[PDB]
Amino acid sequence: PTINQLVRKPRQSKIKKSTSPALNKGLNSFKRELTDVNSPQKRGVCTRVGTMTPKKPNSALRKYARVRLSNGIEVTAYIPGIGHNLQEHSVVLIRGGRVKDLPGVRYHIVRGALDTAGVENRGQSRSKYGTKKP
Amino acid sequence: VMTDPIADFLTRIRNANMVKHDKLELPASKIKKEIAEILKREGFIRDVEYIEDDNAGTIRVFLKYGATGERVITGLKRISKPGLRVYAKSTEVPKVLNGLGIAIVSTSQGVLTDKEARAKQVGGEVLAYVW
RNA sequence: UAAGGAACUCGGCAAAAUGACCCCGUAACUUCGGGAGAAGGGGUGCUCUAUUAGGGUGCAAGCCCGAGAGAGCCGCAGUGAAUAGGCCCAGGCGACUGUUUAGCAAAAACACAGGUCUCUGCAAAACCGUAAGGUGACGUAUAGGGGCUGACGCCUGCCCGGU
RNA sequence: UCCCGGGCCUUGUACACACCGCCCGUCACACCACGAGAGUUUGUAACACCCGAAGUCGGUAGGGUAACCGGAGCCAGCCGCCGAAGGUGGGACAGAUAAUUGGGGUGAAGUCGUAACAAGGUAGCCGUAUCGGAAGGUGCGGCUGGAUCACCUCCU
RNA sequence: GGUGCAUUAGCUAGUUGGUAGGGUAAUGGCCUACCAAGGCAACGAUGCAUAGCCGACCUGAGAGGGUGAUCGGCCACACUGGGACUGAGACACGGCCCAGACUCCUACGGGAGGCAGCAGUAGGGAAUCUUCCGCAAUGGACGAAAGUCUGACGGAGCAACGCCGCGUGUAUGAAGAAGGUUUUCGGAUCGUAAAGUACUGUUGUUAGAGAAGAACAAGGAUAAGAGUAACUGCUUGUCCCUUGACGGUAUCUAACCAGAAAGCCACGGCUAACUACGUGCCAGCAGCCGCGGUAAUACGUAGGUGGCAAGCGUUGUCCGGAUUUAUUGGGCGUAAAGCGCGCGCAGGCGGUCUUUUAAGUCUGAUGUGAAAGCCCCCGGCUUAACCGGGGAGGGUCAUUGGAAACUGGAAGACUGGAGUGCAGAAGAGGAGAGUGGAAUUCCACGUGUAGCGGUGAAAUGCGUAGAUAUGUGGAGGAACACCAGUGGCGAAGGCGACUCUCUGGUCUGUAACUGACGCUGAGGCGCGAAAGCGUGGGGAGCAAACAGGAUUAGAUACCCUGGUAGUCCACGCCGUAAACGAUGAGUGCUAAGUGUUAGGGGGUUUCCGCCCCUUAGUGCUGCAGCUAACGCAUUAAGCACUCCGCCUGGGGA
Ligand SMILES: [Mg+2]
Ligand SMILES: [Mg+2]
Ligand SMILES: [Mg+2]
Ligand SMILES: [Mg+2]
Ligand SMILES: [Mg+2]
Ligand SMILES: [Mg+2]
Ligand SMILES: [Mg+2]
Ligand SMILES: [Mg+2]
Ligand SMILES: [Mg+2]
Ligand SMILES: [Mg+2]
Ligand SMILES: [Mg+2]
Ligand SMILES: [Mg+2]
Ligand SMILES: [Mg+2]
Ligand SMILES: [Mg+2]
Ligand SMILES: [Mg+2]
Ligand SMILES: [Mg+2]
Ligand SMILES: [Mg+2]
Ligand SMILES: [Mg+2]
Ligand SMILES: [Mg+2]
Ligand SMILES: [Mg+2]
Ligand SMILES: [Mg+2]
Ligand SMILES: [Mg+2]
Ligand SMILES: [Mg+2]
Ligand SMILES: [Mg+2]
Ligand SMILES: [Mg+2]
Ligand SMILES: [Mg+2]
Ligand SMILES: [Mg+2]
Ligand SMILES: [Mg+2]
Ligand SMILES: [Mg+2]
Ligand SMILES: [Mg+2]
Ligand SMILES: [Mg+2]
Ligand SMILES: [Mg+2]
Ligand SMILES: [Mg+2]
Ligand SMILES: [Mg+2]
Ligand SMILES: [Mg+2]
Ligand SMILES: [Mg+2]
Ligand SMILES: [Mg+2]
Ligand SMILES: [Mg+2]
Ligand SMILES: [Mg+2]
Ligand SMILES: [Mg+2]
Ligand SMILES: [Mg+2]
Ligand SMILES: [Mg+2]
Ligand SMILES: [Mg+2]
Ligand SMILES: [Mg+2]
Ligand SMILES: [Mg+2]
Ligand SMILES: [Mg+2]
Ligand SMILES: [Mg+2]
Ligand SMILES: [Mg+2]
Ligand SMILES: [Mg+2]
Ligand SMILES: [Mg+2]
Ligand SMILES: [Mg+2]
Ligand SMILES: [Mg+2]
Ligand SMILES: [Mg+2]
Ligand SMILES: [Mg+2]
Ligand SMILES: [Mg+2]
Ligand SMILES: [Mg+2]
Ligand SMILES: [Mg+2]
Ligand SMILES: [Mg+2]
Ligand SMILES: [Mg+2]
Ligand SMILES: [Mg+2]
Ligand SMILES: [Mg+2]
Ligand SMILES: [Mg+2]
Ligand SMILES: [Mg+2]
Ligand SMILES: [Mg+2]
Ligand SMILES: [Mg+2]
Ligand SMILES: [Mg+2]
Ligand SMILES: [Mg+2]
Ligand SMILES: [Mg+2]
Ligand SMILES: [Mg+2]
Ligand SMILES: [Mg+2]
Ligand SMILES: [Mg+2]
Ligand SMILES: [Mg+2]
Ligand SMILES: [Mg+2]
Ligand SMILES: [Mg+2]
Ligand SMILES: [Mg+2]
Ligand SMILES: [Mg+2]
Ligand SMILES: [Mg+2]
Ligand SMILES: [Mg+2]
Ligand SMILES: [Mg+2]
Ligand SMILES: [Mg+2]
Ligand SMILES: [Mg+2]
Ligand SMILES: [Mg+2]
Ligand SMILES: [Mg+2]
Ligand SMILES: [Mg+2]
Ligand SMILES: [Mg+2]
Ligand SMILES: [Mg+2]
Ligand SMILES: [Mg+2]
Ligand SMILES: [Mg+2]
Ligand SMILES: [Mg+2]
Ligand SMILES: [Mg+2]
Ligand SMILES: [Mg+2]
Ligand SMILES: [Mg+2]
Ligand SMILES: [Mg+2]
Ligand SMILES: [Mg+2]
Ligand SMILES: [Mg+2]
Ligand SMILES: [Mg+2]
Ligand SMILES: [Mg+2]
Ligand SMILES: [Mg+2]
Ligand SMILES: [Mg+2]
Ligand SMILES: [Mg+2]
Ligand SMILES: [Mg+2]
Ligand SMILES: [Mg+2]
Ligand SMILES: [Mg+2]
Ligand SMILES: [Mg+2]
Ligand SMILES: [Mg+2]
Ligand SMILES: [Mg+2]
Ligand SMILES: [Mg+2]
Ligand SMILES: [Mg+2]
Ligand SMILES: [Mg+2]
Ligand SMILES: [Mg+2]
Ligand SMILES: [Mg+2]
Ligand SMILES: [Mg+2]
Ligand SMILES: [Mg+2]
Ligand SMILES: [Mg+2]
Ligand SMILES: [Mg+2]
Ligand SMILES: [Mg+2]
Ligand SMILES: [Mg+2]
Ligand SMILES: [Mg+2]
Ligand SMILES: [Mg+2]
Ligand SMILES: [Mg+2]
């Protein structure tokens, strides 16, 4: 536009949107109000463990969890690796990462950080899945 | 209406170059005299003459082309428009096309090219780029 | 009338409570007028400054009217007696003011402004009377009589076989 | 002339698994987010009155009192203004929650029809009004983002 | 000078100014009495939300974007509110008084407290350290001085948290040890890596030597000074003596040992690095494209390889790539994007010349922009990191001196813009009043007999109560046949029978007149097809809704027969359209060819007519140029300047 037009009202840029809303939120129990702080991991107790099927054309059975975070938000996570040991009423650590096949799953459960244990008989890429040196 | 007579001088030359016109004439003004006179100093235009009339006089410019019809002027640009005037300090005077072109500056010592301005440590309004 | 304060009862029926003047302040909703005295609060006595500051009247003498303030004084209490709105939230019905069963029912009933259908060309239709004579009307379809509905807002669907 | 299979040219296309294509809306089921909702419950900043500690200031001081000339001055006590917290009242704003409800989105296989894409079998679309299970139909005005069917006019 | 919201438009009453006084270190509504009604705001007041500010830090080619931890400067706070005393300085972190919440001691009367000081504890969290040693150095408070105090500060401890340095051995050694892993079974690869021989000690273990950081102060002798009647004493100079937490720390030399010291992620493409076996849309992988359905270089494990290395990967946040908010550096015919159109306040921009001024503009000097940090040049730690010395940069900064081209201000001058005058022309431009002829419908009367009407076929319907057809007359309403034409007029919507009245604009010629009087134009005010709404009329044709007949598997439709609102008029609303050239307004420049509307000039000719030139419109074809293409092309979507409007993936919407 013309310079005079561009002075009367300047250029406003677009605002990005975070893809992990629950990870970057806090809580204050004294005030019962969510505070705005960023955080790479959060922990919570899982309330339901199960599976659903991915979108087309995939056909597997993906093992998920339903975790209640420490700041009081109910989210859906995903267990990587072959086989786990999760049960209802278990404390786990979640971290960022979205899985494409699953519709609503937006977080990953880290393996080897808390009650959740590492994957059995992992020989390579062991830093992920939290399996110690054999 | 007419808001920038200097821009017309710049664009009339450009419009005549595309069709290889050998001359053009346009209403005269004091500031256009130096700009047209400057171009003759570096060979950008082959000649210039003044015609005296009632209203403001008239100036015609004779364009220049090389042997086998190559343009001598390959572009003209206006910098300090009426909507946004620009000014340059002594060290901010540019070099159009890495010294192969010229810039016309309206200093406090007169209208003179960029090369001459840096020899006198003066600034002013940058008027045109000719290359 | 101690303490309680609707526990009474079909139902706060009856009683209690508010009540004057001056100042501050005031919601939803609205047909923009209202609601509204919404709600909720504060001040009032007497003495001195004081025939005040200032007004009405008169030629002047004089007479009448009387805000703000300051300082004080006295009571449990100062419109010290009598007279003088209780208020708020939500729903049904009727738009409203009005009328009604003299002597059991005052209302959600009747009326109403507005809507619509229909009859009437003037010796009008309609009504009283056996008739004469009248009202309608000393009017004339923007007028007159009858039936239904009832401010205002949005609307008023299908059936003409039967009467 | 029609029915079937095929060959050339042209036209339109939202088709390319290539019309046995593509694709619209209601209805039944499941999930998710958002709005309304008789109400309920947390919190923020103020405002108007009532009451008002400490304290500085102002007035008295009949009680106490070494310096200075009984006097002065001083102090305790009492009184007045201002005043934090507290109480009462009507509003403003922000979040959560609530029987129920409204449209929206997602789900290969369910039911109904086939509105659009070819002249899509009534050309389509835009504004508006009315009607209908549903896509939608019809009236009025407008557009070509129409292949079309006939005389004339301009350009090559 | 440095932030978001207009889906936050009014705010304020000691508020705004004045007069007299009080109070303060000091001016001042800082406070009080009187007087007046002012003050702020679209250049964004007020309100809500968020936030300590800066030097600087990260990123970036730069312009910018994000941040304000550590170090330095300023500010505010000290459990939460309020108040004052003492003092040069406080409304006071380890001071006082009152009120509140909490913890503790009470003999029930009353009392005592504040780690956002250094350590440490519980809690919250994905997440952060020792309840250590010294005043030896530096700086503080007190003292005349030794000296006392100093969780400031010097050191030590824990944590791969980051940056820097180098150690996990060197050299020679096979057509090539064994063993893995594959093989069309010959071989290939791990691999010169083994093993062998020769060598080294950075690191390790042991034992010996052992720094700087120290200047001091005080105390003792002197010497010289100012001051002295004279000392004591004071100031400066030189000698003597004295002090280490770190710590026997750093650092040397003596010997023995290849011995105690390598992991992490990827190998389909992006992107450097591929083969076997297992599984069989299962297990599973994934940043995107997407891999897996009994021969997977993509899943799991091996062999091999590739990137780094005391690390390596994942997650979260910021900048870049992103020209994806485009000042540098984008756009709006068909992809998102020109308001439906006009009149215009504020604002933005503005023809030619002369004189002057110096606000903008350019330039010199002075003051300042602390230190640390980035950058440049030197020097110390065995190198580096790190630390010193000097410099540079960094401002729409303040005072002062110059220049006058450009923008601005002032004084004049001109006519190519704009407007008036004078002479002509064309037009369905608008409002009001009246009139005309075809045609449809209804009504009355002659003539006349059996059908008419309708469809792809039919039927409903009309007709013997005499229709359709035909001749005559009457009533009423709506639209204007031919002319009629990518013809005309208007800002757009739009305007077509005729006459008159009242009115707006445009074009051409002249050069008399004024002399820049102009363009665009957010808010504001008006106009604005059709449908629709209110009140009063009118109602011939047409016709949503509706009814009947057909078609169809069904047909709330297309087709047929009827038909109400509406369409028409007056007044008042509504404010939309594919309101379209899907193209904002103004101005100038840039090949031609040819129709047409309204004018002007010239030549031929008596006219007519033909030709040429020119102004303003309206169409077609085409060059340069532009475009993704289609296409536009003097009526631009080409080349330029000014102002306004709008856009930033789709759905939700
Ligand atoms: Mg992997
Ligand atoms: Mg009692
Ligand atoms: Mg009592
Ligand atoms: Mg009570
Ligand atoms: Mg009660
Ligand atoms: Mg009882
Ligand atoms: Mg009862
Ligand atoms: Mg009573
Ligand atoms: Mg008086
Ligand atoms: Mg009384
Ligand atoms: Mg009373
Ligand atoms: Mg009543
Ligand atoms: Mg009675
Ligand atoms: Mg009679
Ligand atoms: Mg009679
Ligand atoms: Mg009579
Ligand atoms: Mg009438
Ligand atoms: Mg009614
Ligand atoms: Mg009734
Ligand atoms: Mg009504
Ligand atoms: Mg009815
Ligand atoms: Mg009947
Ligand atoms: Mg009948
Ligand atoms: Mg052939
Ligand atoms: Mg396709
Ligand atoms: Mg169809
Ligand atoms: Mg219909
Ligand atoms: Mg139509
Ligand atoms: Mg089309
Ligand atoms: Mg400021
Ligand atoms: Mg004063
Ligand atoms: Mg003030
Ligand atoms: Mg503000
Ligand atoms: Mg960049
Ligand atoms: Mg920068
Ligand atoms: Mg800190
Ligand atoms: Mg605390
Ligand atoms: Mg003091
Ligand atoms: Mg305090
Ligand atoms: Mg202190
Ligand atoms: Mg302070
Ligand atoms: Mg302090
Ligand atoms: Mg403390
Ligand atoms: Mg206490
Ligand atoms: Mg601490
Ligand atoms: Mg802890
Ligand atoms: Mg914890
Ligand atoms: Mg010390
Ligand atoms: Mg010291
Ligand atoms: Mg001293
Ligand atoms: Mg001590
Ligand atoms: Mg210590
Ligand atoms: Mg320290
Ligand atoms: Mg370390
Ligand atoms: Mg680690
Ligand atoms: Mg082998
Ligand atoms: Mg072998
Ligand atoms: Mg050694
Ligand atoms: Mg030793
Ligand atoms: Mg030793
Ligand atoms: Mg010392
Ligand atoms: Mg000494
Ligand atoms: Mg001596
Ligand atoms: Mg001596
Ligand atoms: Mg000495
Ligand atoms: Mg030793
Ligand atoms: Mg040595
Ligand atoms: Mg050795
Ligand atoms: Mg590769
Ligand atoms: Mg396989
Ligand atoms: Mg891969
Ligand atoms: Mg693999
Ligand atoms: Mg391997
Ligand atoms: Mg390797
Ligand atoms: Mg390293
Ligand atoms: Mg890392
Ligand atoms: Mg990351
Ligand atoms: Mg950018
Ligand atoms: Mg773009
Ligand atoms: Mg444009
Ligand atoms: Mg489109
Ligand atoms: Mg578009
Ligand atoms: Mg337009
Ligand atoms: Mg202006
Ligand atoms: Mg100018
Ligand atoms: Mg100007
Ligand atoms: Mg500096
Ligand atoms: Mg060096
Ligand atoms: Mg340094
Ligand atoms: Mg330096
Ligand atoms: Mg000049
Ligand atoms: Mg001068
Ligand atoms: Mg003119
Ligand atoms: Mg006319
Ligand atoms: Mg007209
Ligand atoms: Mg006729
Ligand atoms: Mg048939
Ligand atoms: Mg007839
Ligand atoms: Mg026009
Ligand atoms: Mg006129
Ligand atoms: Mg006219
Ligand atoms: Mg015209
Ligand atoms: Mg003149
Ligand atoms: Mg205009
Ligand atoms: Mg406007
Ligand atoms: Mg209409
Ligand atoms: Mg009407
Ligand atoms: Mg009507
Ligand atoms: Mg039907
Ligand atoms: Mg009909
Ligand atoms: Mg009208
Ligand atoms: Mg709309
Ligand atoms: Mg529109
Ligand atoms: Mg149109
Ligand atoms: Mg448009
Ligand atoms: Mg233009
Ligand atoms: Mg143009
Ligand atoms: Mg033309
Ligand atoms: Mg989106
Ligand atoms: Mg969006």
TrEMBL record, chain A:
A single MF term (Gene Ontology): tRNA binding
Positions of region (Disordered): 1-25
Biological processes, Gene Ontology terms: translation
GO CC annotation: small ribosomal subunit
Pfam family, one: Ribosom_S12_S23
Ranges of compositional bias, category Basic residues: 8-17
Statement: the UniProt record of this protein carries the keyword tRNA-binding: yes
Highest taxon above the source species: Bacteria
Keywords of this entry: Ribonucleoprotein, Ribosomal protein, RNA-binding, rRNA-binding, tRNA-binding
Function: With S4 and S5 plays an important role in translational accuracy.
Oligomeric form and interacting partners: Part of the 30S ribosomal subunit. Contacts proteins S8 and S17. May interact with IF1 in the 30S initiation complex.
Annotated family: Belongs to the universal ribosomal protein uS12 family.
PANTHER family for the chain: 30S RIBOSOMAL PROTEIN S12 FAMILY MEMBER
Name listed for the protein in its UniProt record: Small ribosomal subunit protein uS12
Gene name tied to this protein: rpsL
Automatic annotation (TrEMBL), chain B:
Quaternary data: Part of the 30S ribosomal subunit. Contacts proteins S5 and S12.
Keywords: Ribonucleoprotein, Ribosomal protein, RNA-binding, rRNA-binding
Encoding gene per record: rpsH
Family, per entry: Belongs to the universal ribosomal protein uS8 family.
NCBIfam families associated with the record: PRK00136.1
GO molecular function terms attached to this record: rRNA binding; structural constituent of ribosome
Tree of life domain: Bacteria
InterPro entries given in the database record: Ribosomal_uS8 (IPR000630), Ribosomal_uS8_CS (IPR047863), Ribosomal_uS8_sf (IPR035987)
A Pfam family this chain is assigned to: Ribosomal_S8
Name of this chain's protein: Small ribosomal subunit protein uS8
Protein source organism: Listeria innocua
One GO cellular component term noted in the UniProt record for this chain: ribosome
Listed GO biological process terms: translation
UniProt cross-references to HAMAP family, sorted A to Z: Ribosomal_uS8_B (MF_01302_B)
Known role: One of the primary rRNA binding proteins, it binds directly to 16S rRNA central domain where it helps coordinate assembly of the platform of the 30S subunit.
